[PDB]
Nucleic acid binder design. Sequence first.
RNA 1: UUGUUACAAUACACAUUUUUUGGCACCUGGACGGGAAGAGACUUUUUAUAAAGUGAGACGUCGCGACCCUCGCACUGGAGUCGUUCUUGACUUUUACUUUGGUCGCUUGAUGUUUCUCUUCCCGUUCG
Lengths: 60, 88, 102, 82, 72, 214, 77, 106, 97
Amino acid sequence: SDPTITIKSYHLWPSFTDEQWITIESQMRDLILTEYGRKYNVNISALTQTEIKDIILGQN
Amino acid sequence: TEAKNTLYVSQLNEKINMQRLRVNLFLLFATFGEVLKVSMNFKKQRGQAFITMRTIDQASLAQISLNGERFFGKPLKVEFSKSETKTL
Amino acid sequence: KIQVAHSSRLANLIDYKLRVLTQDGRVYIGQLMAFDKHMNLVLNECIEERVPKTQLDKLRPRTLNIKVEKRVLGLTILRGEQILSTVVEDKPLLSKKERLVR
Amino acid sequence: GIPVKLLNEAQGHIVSLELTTGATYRGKLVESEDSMNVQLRDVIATEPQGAVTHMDQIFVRGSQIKFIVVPDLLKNAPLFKK
Amino acid sequence: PELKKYMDKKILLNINGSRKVAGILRGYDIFLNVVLDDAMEINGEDPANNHQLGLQTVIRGNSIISLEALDA
Amino acid sequence: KFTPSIVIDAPQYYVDHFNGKYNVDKCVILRDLQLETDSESMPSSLKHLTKPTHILDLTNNDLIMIPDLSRRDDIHTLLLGRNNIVEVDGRLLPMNVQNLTLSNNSIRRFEDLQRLRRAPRTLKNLTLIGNQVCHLANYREHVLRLVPHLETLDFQNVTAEERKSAMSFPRKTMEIMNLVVSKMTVERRNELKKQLAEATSLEEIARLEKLLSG
Amino acid sequence: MVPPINCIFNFLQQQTPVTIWLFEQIGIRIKGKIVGFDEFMNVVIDEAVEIPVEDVEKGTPLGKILLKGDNITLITS
Amino acid sequence: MKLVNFLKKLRNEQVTIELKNGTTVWGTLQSVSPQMNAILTDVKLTLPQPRLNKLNSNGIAMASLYLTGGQQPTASDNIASLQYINIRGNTIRQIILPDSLNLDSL
Amino acid sequence: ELSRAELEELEEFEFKHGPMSLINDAMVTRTPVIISLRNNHKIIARVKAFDRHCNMVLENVKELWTEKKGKNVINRERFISKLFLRGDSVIVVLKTP
RNA sequence: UUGUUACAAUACACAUUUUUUGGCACCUGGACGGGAAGAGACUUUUUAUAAAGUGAGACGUCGCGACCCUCGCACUGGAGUCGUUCUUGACUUUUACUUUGGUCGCUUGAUGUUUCUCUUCCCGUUCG
């Protein structure tokens, strides 16, 4: 999403900083939980972090 | 002489600009019919116009109503044309 | 305001009245009679219109109306190279010669 | 196509040219080419500055011509028939 | 390119930029490249402001605006 | 009566009158149809009026007001003659109107025309022949006071001294039947009178009403 | 009748200096000798100088250049 | 050769076309010709206001935007709207494409 | 002149040996080019295709351009996801390190 | 209802001078319009104040008003190829032009283009 953040020849993922990683992981959480909320018909804004952890890892 | 679609207008003011004669001959005759054409060729036919209406029942009414009307300070004359307009 | 079929190209718009923009900020308005591979464009009963610089500034962002210059041209061929866009003004109306009732 | 077979039917009539530079040339069309080159005779000419002049003959390169005005009589020339 | 009618008869050519040159038309091709002889740059008032180009001059056709045969 | 359906089938064509040669001005014809002013229906009908429209021929109807066409800017000519108009509220004329006709309407006092103050400054031509304010005292010199920059009234060219003087002040269908009779040969009057005495059928009344109106 | 490309060739083989006038860029002209010519009127110029607009005193030397034909208006003696 | 026949597989998408005037055209892409003449419908033509401010560069763009016959009641930032525009292909600078499109299928 | 199949293979040869092979290396390596456009805008993007005319489908676009406000001059910084680019508007393409 | 022949489609191709693979970019109060007024500035007579006019110089186009041509059935009109009938529809080809025009007044009725460097009174349309 930002070509100023290159992928090194010997790496697989772009060269984010820690702050950029926090931003990226938050956006990824929003994406996954948006699809989950549509599929299962649940209010994402009410979920606990432990429920979110189970959803991310794919428990059951 | 036979009543037909086309009026002959025959005593128009000379000193008035032709362009606004054509505009105002549209406006005058409009309230007595749907005016299709207002032909004016002053080199070939000075101080005259030919006007063609959608229906005979508008040509006759305008021929009656406007003959002798004062139009740019001169009393107009209006009669039936001996023809109908080709170019239209 | 006019609506034209979404499947319609410039070969169908014969006799429609087009308003044709050009690279210099002028617009030509006329009945499309014919056209070519190059987008060379023949317009009957044509009008050129332009926004003069005196009141172009009235389009700067702030009951909005603009007095265009207009100029009248007979049966123009526009060279396609100059054309910027084409817009449709209205459809092929009946001739007044059709309205005449015996 | 027709936007050039028209300009070939315009022969012997007065046509008015405008050019990309802003000049304008009105005169009798002597010869025209499929490239839109034209030759005008007895020509009334106008500068982009609005200054006006007259000149005996001119040839104009097609790539400069903005538009060509043609006599209104050609709308019923055989060219447009199906 | 119907320049055959002119031959060597003197031409003034309007050229890209404002520029003007005038000379004796020797030859031409399908692009309207023009080769012309005794060419003067028609820059302005002749006795000080014009310039005489050289014994052979050739103009690239995309730069010809228009050309007026001032000889007839 | 003023439906959204009759404005869309309204006959229309290009006309040369305003330019002489080239058919570059478009007329919409809503004449001879007896439309009338509804405060709800009409402004939801005239938003289906075709664009552009240059001449809008609303003549010989039963309108009681200028139909609100205020925000449109295409219309240059607006024919409203032979309508039951009371007052000319100028704010409801189109933005760029040029050329207005109000002949043979029902306007009778100077406070009817008083709202022409709000008409566009680019209005140049007006017509009020056959009204009854037409006959009131020094009416021309009054209506020039309302719209000084105008160019014509009742097909009289507004001359220089008239508009110069304008700045001094701060310092029912049987109309046509009578109109024909007013303008008729006395012997033909004494022939159609006899024909009306001779009349013998309802269709012959219809024929006689053709003669009595042209 | 002298075709124009043949006149370009008659500048080339005779190794005469030339002045070349550019297309939209009126403020400098190119002077030098035509070494190479082309189907598309590209040219190669040796001992090239670009002279502002008026004379040789103010010019600056380029070396050997290829000047792309899309930028040529006149070639002159 | 290739990439105009890629645009031809975008029929009925919501493109944004940016012309070389800097004028931006949002639109339902009805067609693209082999010369790249785009037809758009339900169209919305915009000069961006940071650009529009300088008249000397943008007067050609504003004058041609207004003269389409579709400039709105100046609600903001010189929009127009047209049912149909036919664009001559050489005028197009960029085409910003729908965000969800799977380009690799085309 | 040449046959259609020969022209096809010639286009492949030109894309690999010619100047265009800078763009091709970036398209195959999936690394971002920089593209100075004719209107002084610089695109930064990953190439997904190109053709003879230097048209190119781009993805992952960032687009830098500069704006002035009298004495001040300032940077804009639009992001775009998927963009066709008409070739003629291209001044010079880089490949970043 | 169907088939054969003649001419235009289209897909295809289409970056190096005449079109579509770029010489282009850079550069209470505020607002709007009409008519009276004033300071300041500019032109001219004249000198180390006295008097008459209007941010300055320049070029086109509609339009307005006044004076000379003007007495009325026109727009394609002739000639030829044919249906139908006391000359009305379709087609081919000569002829020179199809716009009334010449002059003056605009101390400007408006309008479009080039060169150089401020307030008061009312009136009308909006804002809160």
